[PDB]
């Protein structure tokens, strides 16, 4: 009874890669999707220089070794959150990829907000949505900037509410408030499609694992 619930929720945290997210991606796979391509040196943020492999004739290149390490952590965190039945909200303001990101959230079984973000959505949730509204447990920022080249309002407002954020950060973004930054290209369609696939496969695996874990432990109770 109580032992089974402890097994379902506490056993997953005793393994470094419980969901085997390492196999989903590789440095070679990321390089095919152009995840190493950054903005010009003029557009560079000072807090992104750690993640930048170098400047190839004006275009910053993103180290895909740091990206692989950080992406492993971010996918690992996103899976445990999905395993525990947490709410995951995808957030982006890029209108080229608005339909793709809304389609991904629907495929995963999660939520997407790709439209104009209302001031107070998280800091004033009860008024906007209702008294007992449950806020997201994780926000994934496929794009961390809005369409005026400023940080998305939900980055600061998600920290105010103490919500962890998994965000794709490019060479012109500010990763300081992103809990799990993933350095990588955010503009190319091939990069965004790769990231959307990874987050969708990861979330579906974690949800499937929970069902199997519950069936095995549940069956033991009669058996």
């Amino acid at each position: 009874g109580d032992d089974f619930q402890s097994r379902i929720l506490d056993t997953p945290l005793q393994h470094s890669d419980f969901f085997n997210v390492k196999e989903l991606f590789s440095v070679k796979s990321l390089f095919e999707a152009r995840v190493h391509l950054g903005h010009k040196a003029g557009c560079r943020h000072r807090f992104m220089e750690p993640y930048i492999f170098g400047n190839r004739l004006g275009q910053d290149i993103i180290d895909l070794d740091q990206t692989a390490l950080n992406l492993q952590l971010a996918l690992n965190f996103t899976a445990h959150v999905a395993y525990r039945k947490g709410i995951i909200l995808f957030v982006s303001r890029n209108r080229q990829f608005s339909h793709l990101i809304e389609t991904t959230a629907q495929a995963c079984g999660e939520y997407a907000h790709t439209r104009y973000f209302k001031g107070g959505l998280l800091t004033n949730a009860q008024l906007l949505f209702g008294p007992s509204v449950r806020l997201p447990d994780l926000i994934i920022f496929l794009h961390t900037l809005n369409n005026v080249f400023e940080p998305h309002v939900a980055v600061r407002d998600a920290a105010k509410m103490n919500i962890p954020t998994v965000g794709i950060v490019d060479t012109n973004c500010n990763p300081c408030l992103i809990t799990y930054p993933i350095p990588g290209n955010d503009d190319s369609p091939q990069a965004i499609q790769l990231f959307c696939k990874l987050f969708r496969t990861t979330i579906n695996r974690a949800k499937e694992k929970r069902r199997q874990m519950e069936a095995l432990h549940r069956l033991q109770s009669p058996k």
Binding site: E102, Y111, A112, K118, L121, F129
Partner: protein, 42 residues
């Protein structure tokens, strides 16, 4: 609903469908006045 946190889940759920329809018509490829004496709903 997956668009609950947008604040207009039904307006954006409808705008999601019509934008997906447009994409398939644009990807896949007569007179358009199939209906006359009609107006768009207010």
């Amino acid at each position: 609903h997956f668009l609950f946190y947008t604040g207009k889940q039904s307006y954006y759920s409808l705008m999601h469908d019509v934008y997906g329809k447009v994409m398939q018509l644009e990807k896949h490829r007569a007179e358009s006045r199939d209906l006359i004496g009609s107006r768009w709903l207010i």
